Amino acid sequence: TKTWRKWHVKVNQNEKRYAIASAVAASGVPSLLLARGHRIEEIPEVPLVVDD
Amino acid sequence: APGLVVGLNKGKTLTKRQLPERPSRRKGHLSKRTAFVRSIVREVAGFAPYERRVMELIRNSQDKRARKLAKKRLGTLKRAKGKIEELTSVIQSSRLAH
Amino acid sequence: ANPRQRNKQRSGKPRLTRRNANKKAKAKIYGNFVIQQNWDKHATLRQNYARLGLLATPNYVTGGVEKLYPDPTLDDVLDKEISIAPAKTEVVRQLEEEAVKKAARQSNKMLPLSAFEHAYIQRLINKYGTEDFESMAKDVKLNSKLFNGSKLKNLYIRMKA
Amino acid sequence: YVKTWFNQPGRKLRRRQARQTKAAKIAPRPVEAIRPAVKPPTIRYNMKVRAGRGFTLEELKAAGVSRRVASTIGIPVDHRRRNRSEESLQRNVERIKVYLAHLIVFPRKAGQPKKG
Amino acid sequence: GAYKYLEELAKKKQSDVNLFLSRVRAWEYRQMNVIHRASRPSRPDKARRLGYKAKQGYVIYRIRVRRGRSARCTAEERVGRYCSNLRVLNSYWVNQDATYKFFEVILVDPSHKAIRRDPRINWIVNPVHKHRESRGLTSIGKKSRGIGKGHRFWLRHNTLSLRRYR
RNA sequence: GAAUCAUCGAAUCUUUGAACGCACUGCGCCUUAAGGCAUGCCUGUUUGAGUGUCAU
RNA sequence: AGAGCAUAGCUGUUGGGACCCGAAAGAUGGUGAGAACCAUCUAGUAGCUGGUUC
RNA sequence: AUUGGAUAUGCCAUAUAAAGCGCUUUCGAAGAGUCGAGUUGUUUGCAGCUCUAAAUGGGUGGUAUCAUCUAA
RNA sequence: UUGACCUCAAAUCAGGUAGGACUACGCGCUGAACAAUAAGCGCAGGAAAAGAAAAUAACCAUGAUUCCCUCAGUAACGGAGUGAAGCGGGAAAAGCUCAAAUUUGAAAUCUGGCAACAUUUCUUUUGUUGUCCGAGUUGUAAUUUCAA
């Protein structure tokens, strides 16, 4: 094994932003939250926004 | 505000300027004292054996012989031409006296 | 692994541990007291300079700056004069007020004559008049130091004040 | 022989700390000196304006700053560069003058002997 | 000044005066040791312009090296080994004959207080200048290893730089 | 004031080894058991010599 | 009336010890007494041999 | 307990001094067995050998005169 | 005879310094097979080396060095292979000291001894002042470094 193996991998900045936008959108769906293991069955609303 | 706009373009309007001469470019100019010192040293110190050969060749005409000898020892022809002019002046100054 | 490092492992002597590992830590400010008082030890040096109303660089910046919020003819250059610039923040005003008040306090730039200087210029004035300095300098007996007209004029001016 | 770059994030942080260590030493003054504006020396880039090394002695003289005090207030001096055109002279004299318009120079204490 | 006359006279390297003196002095220098102390430089103009000052802590040593590596560089390293407490400052050619080339080396004592208190030669006291002649940091050493500015005068190429994100 | 403890600025640190009085423990020298006694080089000090050059 | 650029995977291919293993080179520097022995260059090699995992 | 750079404030300050910027009917020194030429190797550089300079000279470039630089 | 100077000496005279070790990273002198490599030899430091143009360029010009990216696997050499550099973008930026011109109305310079006075990372370290001797006119200071 050698240290100069490829450890870091590039992604187009637009692809990173697409995935982050797509992951924020998925966080607004209660059904996708339940399928990821979150116990949000008593949360009052999704998206959940609190005061400042 | 202080800050440089590092992009392109500043204006194609151009006008030349007149610059003076830098003191470094004055190198090679001959000083009055330096020329005096060189003339004193040239007399005090003798002449090289090859310089004596060139001087005795110049005296008995044989200019092509002197030029060929000076070029052979010094190298380039420019050095040889300068030595002939210098040694010719040495001969004339001496011949005016002794 | 090295025999030196194995040697100190086998020893019963403790290691010369030093604890200096704390990143994210920014150097504390010494030098100007006004800057130190108003410095924010968490913010970066660019964020502190901008808050204090100073310039961290008189040139361009070699990257993108941080955007935290969605914001809503030779004659007339060598001869024009720019009347300074406003102080944006209070910190700059303290720096400017401190500078002018110290310059006013340390403003005595007039040298009074000494015992020798007073006698030297007095002998020259009482003989060669007051308005003629070139003749004063050309004197050899009274003006032994061979001061020129400018130095004798300065000796006169300092004598007055 | 392979040059790895595992210390690339470490060098980024080390240089940032040098900037902060410098700013800690010199509190109110900028961490860089003011550079002139020059033109790159080729037909490909001569329309661009980039940063130079220092200001020429003719630029400093026109702006009113002597070459002995220019370095003391953070103005670099380039004895090598010269102003071949009146545009370069005007572009960098104004740069110096704008720099001097925004400059607060703190006074220094001077020794004044009691006698003459 | 009299150093303008000495500098100009040294250019006439084999005039009547210079050839006679070089022949006479070569005979004397061969009588003494290979490396021997010089009471004063034979070329006070050349030593002066190479950094030598007639004050305590400045030492002049003469050496002959056989003709037939650079000869001046060999003179500097042998003299520097001979007096290992001194720092080699510079060197210069003084004479040569059919068999030998003669050089004088200017050495500086970094422990003398006249050297350690002179800011113009203070730099030589620092340990980074220990045996400059052995690392090619003298004038002839720099010239010998092609150190200079211009187009007239490898490890970073034989490497393969592999960035993180590549 | 315990410590097979920590810190650590003071003392001690056998014979060797660049290893240094000569061999390599003997064999020595000088001075007052102790102090010492390697080599090269640099600055100075002191004592000498020279048919060296000059002055009286 | 432009179709490319970037990243990832796959496959092929060319180099790096380059699927693993198997013959002594030669050279440099030493040890002991021509020859011998030791350590590194050096993963210098096998047109091949043997092996190569649900 | 050690020390950094500053600040403020006393006491001294050998200033008959020392600097920057104006001006010129006055001056302006610049590194040699080195550059270079020829010939042998190593790799244009370096070195040996024979010879050996110049003062608006010398180096290096674009001209194929101009530009740039000021080595030992 | 004595003295000045020079030269050669000597001294267990006083005060200093060098060697050896470690060498991952410096810089040198070398040097095979197959690489300007290994090995050999020499010399350093916390970095080393380099460094304020006898540098580029041919432009509206740039402006010490070093390092990174790019130039570019390009030009060139020699088809293969070897393989840069100027520009450009970044990191960091800092500039200077002498030789060569008479201080000549004043060797203005420096080491050492001795004696005091301080001072300390420190009774262990550093100086200052005074005096004497020495160095130095075959040149030690101030002044100047071409950007002038």
Coordinates of N, CA and C in Angstrom, one line a residue, chain B residues 8-77:
Chain B
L8 N -8.3 44.1 -17.0 CA -7.7 44.6 -18.2 C -8.2 46.0 -18.5
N9 N -7.4 46.7 -19.4 CA -7.7 48.0 -19.9 C -7.5 49.1 -18.9
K10 N -6.7 50.1 -19.4 CA -6.6 51.4 -18.7 C -6.8 52.6 -19.6
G11 N -6.8 52.4 -20.9 CA -6.9 53.5 -21.9 C -5.8 53.4 -22.9
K12 N -6.2 53.3 -24.2 CA -5.2 53.2 -25.3 C -4.5 54.5 -25.6
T13 N -5.0 55.7 -25.1 CA -4.4 56.9 -25.3 C -3.0 56.9 -24.7
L14 N -2.0 57.1 -25.5 CA -0.6 57.0 -25.2 C 0.2 58.2 -25.6
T15 N 1.2 58.6 -24.8 CA 2.1 59.7 -25.1 C 3.4 59.4 -24.5
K16 N 4.5 59.4 -25.4 CA 5.8 59.0 -24.9 C 6.4 60.1 -23.9
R17 N 7.4 59.6 -23.2 CA 8.1 60.5 -22.3 C 9.6 60.4 -22.5
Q18 N 10.3 61.5 -22.2 CA 11.7 61.6 -22.4 C 12.4 61.3 -21.1
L19 N 13.2 60.3 -21.1 CA 13.9 59.9 -19.9 C 15.4 60.4 -19.9
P20 N 15.9 60.7 -18.8 CA 17.4 61.0 -18.7 C 18.2 59.8 -18.8
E21 N 19.5 60.0 -18.6 CA 20.5 58.9 -18.6 C 20.8 58.4 -17.2
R22 N 20.8 57.1 -17.0 CA 21.1 56.6 -15.7 C 22.7 56.6 -15.5
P23 N 23.1 56.8 -14.2 CA 24.6 56.9 -14.0 C 25.3 55.7 -14.3
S24 N 24.7 54.5 -14.4 CA 25.4 53.3 -14.8 C 25.8 53.3 -16.2
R25 N 25.0 53.9 -17.1 CA 25.3 54.0 -18.5 C 26.5 54.8 -18.8
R26 N 27.0 55.6 -17.8 CA 28.2 56.4 -18.0 C 29.5 55.6 -17.8
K27 N 29.3 54.3 -17.5 CA 30.5 53.4 -17.4 C 31.2 53.4 -18.8
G28 N 32.5 53.3 -18.8 CA 33.3 53.3 -20.0 C 33.7 54.7 -20.4
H29 N 33.2 55.7 -19.8 CA 33.7 57.1 -20.0 C 35.0 57.2 -19.3
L30 N 35.9 57.9 -20.1 CA 37.3 58.0 -19.6 C 37.5 59.2 -18.7
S31 N 38.0 59.0 -17.5 CA 38.3 60.1 -16.6 C 39.6 60.8 -17.0
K32 N 39.7 62.1 -16.7 CA 41.0 62.8 -16.9 C 42.1 62.2 -16.1
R33 N 41.8 61.9 -14.8 CA 42.8 61.4 -13.9 C 43.2 59.9 -14.3
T34 N 42.2 59.1 -14.7 CA 42.4 57.7 -15.0 C 43.3 57.7 -16.2
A35 N 43.1 58.5 -17.3 CA 43.9 58.5 -18.4 C 45.3 59.0 -18.1
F36 N 45.5 59.9 -17.1 CA 46.8 60.3 -16.6 C 47.5 59.1 -15.9
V37 N 46.8 58.4 -15.0 CA 47.4 57.3 -14.3 C 47.8 56.2 -15.3
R38 N 47.0 55.9 -16.3 CA 47.3 54.8 -17.2 C 48.6 55.2 -18.0
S39 N 48.7 56.5 -18.4 CA 49.9 56.9 -19.1 C 51.1 56.9 -18.2
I40 N 51.0 57.2 -17.0 CA 52.2 57.1 -16.0 C 52.6 55.6 -15.9
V41 N 51.6 54.7 -15.7 CA 51.9 53.3 -15.5 C 52.5 52.7 -16.7
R42 N 51.9 53.0 -17.9 CA 52.4 52.5 -19.1 C 53.9 52.8 -19.3
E43 N 54.3 54.0 -18.9 CA 55.7 54.4 -19.0 C 56.6 53.7 -18.0
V44 N 56.1 53.7 -16.7 CA 56.9 53.1 -15.6 C 57.1 51.6 -15.8
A45 N 56.0 50.9 -16.0 CA 56.1 49.5 -16.4 C 56.6 49.4 -17.8
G46 N 57.4 48.4 -18.1 CA 58.0 48.3 -19.4 C 56.9 47.8 -20.4
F47 N 57.3 47.1 -21.4 CA 56.4 46.5 -22.4 C 56.6 45.0 -22.4
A48 N 55.6 44.3 -22.7 CA 55.6 42.8 -22.7 C 56.6 42.4 -23.9
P49 N 57.1 41.2 -23.8 CA 58.0 40.7 -24.9 C 57.3 40.7 -26.2
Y50 N 56.0 40.4 -26.2 CA 55.2 40.5 -27.5 C 55.0 41.9 -27.9
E51 N 54.8 42.8 -26.9 CA 54.6 44.2 -27.3 C 55.9 44.8 -27.9
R52 N 57.1 44.4 -27.4 CA 58.3 44.8 -27.9 C 58.5 44.3 -29.4
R53 N 58.1 43.1 -29.6 CA 58.1 42.5 -31.0 C 57.2 43.4 -31.9
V54 N 56.0 43.7 -31.4 CA 55.1 44.5 -32.3 C 55.6 45.9 -32.5
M55 N 56.2 46.5 -31.5 CA 56.8 47.8 -31.6 C 58.0 47.8 -32.6
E56 N 58.8 46.8 -32.6 CA 60.0 46.8 -33.5 C 59.5 46.4 -34.9
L57 N 58.4 45.7 -35.0 CA 57.8 45.4 -36.4 C 57.2 46.7 -37.0
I58 N 56.5 47.5 -36.1 CA 55.9 48.7 -36.6 C 56.9 49.7 -37.1
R59 N 58.0 49.8 -36.4 CA 59.1 50.8 -36.7 C 59.7 50.5 -38.1
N60 N 59.9 49.2 -38.4 CA 60.4 48.8 -39.7 C 59.2 48.4 -40.7
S61 N 58.3 49.4 -40.8 CA 57.1 49.2 -41.6 C 56.4 47.9 -41.2
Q62 N 56.3 46.9 -42.1 CA 55.8 45.6 -41.8 C 54.5 45.6 -41.0
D63 N 53.6 46.5 -41.4 CA 52.3 46.6 -40.7 C 51.5 45.4 -40.7
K64 N 51.5 44.6 -41.8 CA 50.7 43.4 -41.8 C 51.3 42.3 -40.8
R65 N 52.7 42.4 -40.7 CA 53.3 41.5 -39.7 C 52.9 41.9 -38.3
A66 N 52.9 43.1 -38.0 CA 52.5 43.6 -36.6 C 51.0 43.2 -36.3
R67 N 50.1 43.5 -37.3 CA 48.7 43.2 -37.1 C 48.5 41.7 -36.9
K68 N 49.2 40.9 -37.6 CA 49.1 39.4 -37.5 C 49.6 38.9 -36.2
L69 N 50.7 39.5 -35.7 CA 51.2 39.1 -34.4 C 50.3 39.5 -33.3
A70 N 49.8 40.8 -33.3 CA 48.9 41.3 -32.3 C 47.6 40.4 -32.2
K71 N 47.1 40.1 -33.4 CA 45.9 39.3 -33.4 C 46.1 37.9 -32.8
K72 N 47.3 37.3 -33.1 CA 47.6 36.0 -32.6 C 47.7 35.9 -31.1
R73 N 48.4 37.0 -30.5 CA 48.5 36.9 -29.1 C 47.3 37.4 -28.3
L74 N 46.7 38.6 -28.8 CA 45.6 39.1 -28.1 C 44.3 38.3 -28.3
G75 N 44.1 37.9 -29.6 CA 42.8 37.2 -29.9 C 42.1 37.9 -31.1
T76 N 41.0 38.5 -30.8 CA 40.2 39.1 -31.8 C 40.9 40.3 -32.5
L77 N 40.4 40.7 -33.7 CA 41.1 41.7 -34.4 C 40.9 43.1 -33.8

